[PDB]
Amino acid sequence: TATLGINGFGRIGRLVLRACMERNDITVVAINDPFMDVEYMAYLLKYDSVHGNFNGTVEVSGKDLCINGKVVKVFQAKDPAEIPWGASGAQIVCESTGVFTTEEKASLHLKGGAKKVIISAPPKDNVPMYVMGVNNTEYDPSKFNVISNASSTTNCLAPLAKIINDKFGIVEGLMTTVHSLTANQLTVDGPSKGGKDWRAGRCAGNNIIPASTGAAKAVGKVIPALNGKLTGMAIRVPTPDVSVVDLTCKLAKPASIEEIYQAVKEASNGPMKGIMGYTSDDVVSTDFIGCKYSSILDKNACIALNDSFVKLISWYDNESGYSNRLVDLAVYVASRGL
Template sequence: MRIAINGMGRIGRLLFRRLIDDEKIEVVAVNDIMPVDNLAYLIKYDSVYGTFAKNIIIENQYVEIQNKKIAVFQKEDPETLPWEELDIDVVLECSGNFSTKEKAGKHLTAGAKKVLLSTTGADDIPLLIYGFNQSRLTDDINIISPGGCMTNCSIHVLYILNSISIISAHINILHSYTSRQELVDAPNKNFRRGRAAAESVIPVEIDLHKSMERLMPAMQNKVASSSIRVPVANGAMAFFSIQLHEEVTAEHINLLFKKAANNSYKGIIDYTDEPVVSLDIKGNTHSCVIDGTLTSVIGNHCTIVAWFDNEYGFTSRMIDWLGVLHS
């Protein structure tokens, strides 16, 4: 499979690092407006995941890694990229700027066969979550939204718990700060996002509940969502406060997730009884790790905590999707 990556931010660069040695995948090209030397530097040195062990050579508009030459483009308009000439099977659209059917379709116009977003796309793009509804992929779907890190964490928790029947659910994601926040106080149309990200606990509005309703129509008007950005560079903790139609015990809830983690959801969700913290999840490939030590129940009201690496876990699902598209 010949792939290209459009947008070499946090997700694009991590995918590049992880895919460069994949024997089933050839990284043919990347596109980002940053200078090539800056791109090579940011691939090599990463503040979260450490130094890339392989030597990177810059040669004009190419980077070379272990005799593999990857073309580097700096085009703002995807339609001008030579995807047809390069015979690109899949473009990983990681810029965040082309998440509607019309905009993501520019890659198809340029000659790519498929586009896999790195986010929850607009409503006109199928929302297909690996491990949940990937079987709905059909041959005529050329643009795929695999959701985001929060969606991939939350949908499995709600779906499993809905076997008991959910009355209502509130999801609060304690999430590491992101590039859409400011390092120091600065103007921002969302005032709180403009505050210094590493200095405060910052509430941020999200539309995760809309994705849950798209994926599970039975949850219409039953789910709410919020997020709090915390001063860490990586990792997240999802806190679920859920009312069920019947009384349960913490032991019953934990058993549900243990069985899921060991059977049909193996590799997608995990379960732990260890007293972990966010740093322990760094590099974890699961969409969520249920923390059984923090499950709490009063009557029919339960609270559940799930950890996830918002970058590594999510890129793991994108790589799973490449496996589906390659088969």
């Protein structure tokens, strides 16, 4: 049985834990977050403004947590090299702080006894990115101890892009993601951390906010065939969770929406089971809260100008979908030998 440690018990951290508690093939044994004592961790696990009450029991046992009868070790270290992952029995670390997105910083977990690290974001350096159901089998345990699970937007775009490119071929494409607000945004107009993303510091609750994203370009790394063929941007909106990819692309081979839907349907029921999904219902964002899929094609929202120029709409719970993929990746990493 694979074991997990979580660094940064935030939106992704807590939902990764929730996903692990639902599974027999992986166990959470340790959590680290210096901005959060044990009682606070219990509170933030028990209660969730988006995903409801924790399904199970959460108690404080001295310095640690007792979750569903299992002991989970709790630490409050600011530096990753201070956390005793090995002694806690944690083989794999979910690096979900948002502040250690390089090999240099994320590899500090290995000093504490960790065997492997998964950065819950695209890296700032050349740490390899893997998307489950797309390129995860490319992972080489002899060459990497620190890997990345990319972004939730990449996890939404890449499986759809693979299906479309395999079947019809993408000549060129531009993506917008209409994305729910995140932790780096602010409740009222203020300065963004580092002063880099000025728009992201504007009142999150009443604004439509343009944003940059490398997600579409990152698909060019996950799927080398699409290097230089895809890019895009983000538009941030006041909703607390769930986002949607809007992909406008030109196809090398003509295809109708129905044919695109069928290609997605066959992948969803076959090689991309549990990763790619589809719907023909009149869905809205809240309908996907808690959805474990990486990408859900919205048939009725797709539009075609002609047989070669199309706009594809795909949903994703940026919190829940991604968290389940990270857990999938951890389980897969363990199966390849630690």
